[PDB]
Structures are given as structure tokens and as C-alpha cells.
Design a binder for this molecule. Sequence first.
Ligand code: GNP
Ligand code: MG
Length: 167
Amino acid sequence: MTEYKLVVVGAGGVGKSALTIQLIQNHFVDEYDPTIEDSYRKQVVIDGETCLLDILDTAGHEEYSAMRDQYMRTGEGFLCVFAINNTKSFEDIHHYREQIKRVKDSEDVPMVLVGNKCDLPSRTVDTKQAQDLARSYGIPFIETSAKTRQGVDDAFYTLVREIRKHK
Ligand SMILES: Nc1nc2c(ncn2[C@@H]2O[C@H](COP(=O)(O)OP(=O)(O)NP(=O)(O)O)[C@@H](O)[C@H]2O)c(=O)[nH]1
Ligand SMILES: [Mg+2]
């Protein structure tokens, strides 16, 4: 079986853990438990191909680290997550994309742009804004909610398809 090393990045509080736990456990976590570094595993069938997803869930609030660069470098593909109700998180996406391109030593890294918390009424970032950004990067955009489960499977599955397209 083919294995894919996925990493979930994005600012603090955006729902990185909630998305992963939703994928793995079919459970919504309402509590905020800040992450340092957690790893998960799941077998799935995508486009009729079985695979083993290893998912690295990261800290949103983390300064410079060689250790961070180290675990990031193992990544084949990256979910770049912002919250649609959090404008700074969305502006932060640049930082993450630059960080990824640095550590991977490449301009062509499988990535998906994920706009989470779409269930909240507090939208500050428009879809068109996120679509325009993704397009500029040449990557997909998916809207998600870790609460309703909208787009969750699709975010990860799409990342895998992006990985496949790359190789
Ligand atoms: N309504 C709603 N709340 C969400 C959604 N995703 C996450 N949350 C909430 O947002 C808070 C932070 O989520 P969490 O997954 O812990 O964020 P994180 O990005 O992993 N943070 P960190 O970088 O600190 O580990 C939690 O209270 C969680 O329930 C969503 O789609 N909808
Ligand atoms: Mg987390």
C-alpha cells in the first residue's frame, strides 16, 4: 500500500486539530487544546486506490525551530488552513507557503488551501478572495467546517490527488 505523508499547517485556532480529528474519529472537538506536534494514521480509498495517510498536525503558534523544519521536511503535501472568520489567519497563509517552499527546497510543493469554520456567521474572508489566492498559487481551495464535516474528506483526498499529480 502507498503511503502519503500529509502535514496540516496554519495559524493558531483555525481548526487544524478539529479537521484531523473529524477525519480520523468522526468526532467534533469543541474545546481548544493547543497542539505542539501530533501524528495520526488512516487507511482510505481515493480514486479507487488504497492508501495509508500519515497526518502530521502542527502548532499554529510556534516561532523559529530547526525541529519544526525537520518534521515539515518529511511532508509530501500540505494543508494550509485559515479560518474564514479570521482575516489575519488568511494573511498568514503567505508565511506558511514560504516556510513550506523553504524547507522543501522547491517552488512546486503539493498544497491545498483550506478555509475552515464556514458554519460560523462571522465570515470576514470572502470565497472569491480565497479562490483568487489559491489560483495565484496554482492550488486548490476547499471550504470546510470541522463541525458539520463539510469538505473534510475532500480536503485530504484532494491533497492526495495533488501529491499523485506531482509524481
Ligand atoms: N464552529 C466551528 N468551530 C470550529 C471549527 N474548527 C475548529 N473549531 C473550534 O476552534 C477552536 C480551535 O480549534 P483547533 O482545532 O483546536 O485549532 P488548531 O488550529 O489545531 N490550533 P493550534 O494551532 O493551537 O493547535 C476549538 O474550540 C474548535 O472547536 C469549525 O469548523 N467550526
Ligand atoms: Mg491543534
